Design a protein around this ligand. Structure first.
Ligand SMILES: CO[C@H]1C[C@@H]2CC[C@@H](C)[C@@](O)(O2)C(=O)C(=O)N2CCCC[C@H]2C(=O)O[C@H]([C@H](C)C[C@@H]2CC[C@@H](O)[C@H](OC)C2)CC(=O)[C@H](C)/C=C(\C)[C@@H](O)[C@@H](OC)C(=O)[C@H](C)C[C@H](C)/C=C/C=C/C=C/1C
Ligand SMILES: [Cl-]
Ligand SMILES: [Cl-]
Ligand SMILES: [Cl-]
Length: 107
């Protein structure tokens, strides 16, 4: 599943709701240490809708349990990420993924 380790606490009150758009900054790396992406380096926060299966299960389950302003390390086992298939040309089969996510806003 998804394991969450807080980097900085959020407000402890405002969490993503049904129908809301999450606005985050993230950095992703393979558990071996290779960084594969960062919304921070492109200076553009990442947006996705809660409950719309837009992102991998671990990323959305991690964000759903975060409050506004929280930053956390999410460790995603392959069954909540890209599983046996991987993501073509970027994420191999059976990859555990680490995401550093900050919940910036809810729209
Ligand atoms: C260039 O960078 C890519 C993101 C890259 C791709 C490669 C991976 C390593 C990665 O680097 O992100 C990465 O860090 C990663 O693993 N991510 C991104 C951050 C959230 C977690 C994860 C993810 O789920 O990616 C996603 C993963 C790769 C695929 C999805 C996984 C869940 C599954 O249910 C979905 O089935 C459909 C497919 C990619 C996304 O987060 C993008 C935003 C979402 C989609 C494409 C779909 O949800 C699509 O469904 C119709 C939509 O509704 C979108 C909004 C429609 C519009 C037009 C498309 C926009 C595309 C934007 C693409 C972007 C910024
Ligand atoms: Cl790297
Ligand atoms: Cl920015
Ligand atoms: Cl923002």
């Amino acid at each position: 599943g998804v394991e969450i380790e807080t980097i900085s606490p959020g407000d402890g009150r405002t969490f993503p709701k049904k129908g809301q758009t999450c606005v985050v900054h993230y950095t992703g790396m393979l558990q071996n240490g290779k960084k594969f992406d960062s919304s921070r380096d492109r200076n553009k926060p990442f947006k996705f809708r809660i409950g719309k299966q837009e992102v991998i299960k671990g990323f959305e389950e991690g964000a759903a349990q975060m409050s506004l302003g929280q930053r956390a390390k999410l460790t995603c086992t392959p069954d909540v990420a890209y599983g046996a298939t991987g993501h073509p040309g970027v994420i191999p089969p059976n990859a555990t993924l680490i995401f550093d996510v900050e919940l910036l806003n809810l729209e």
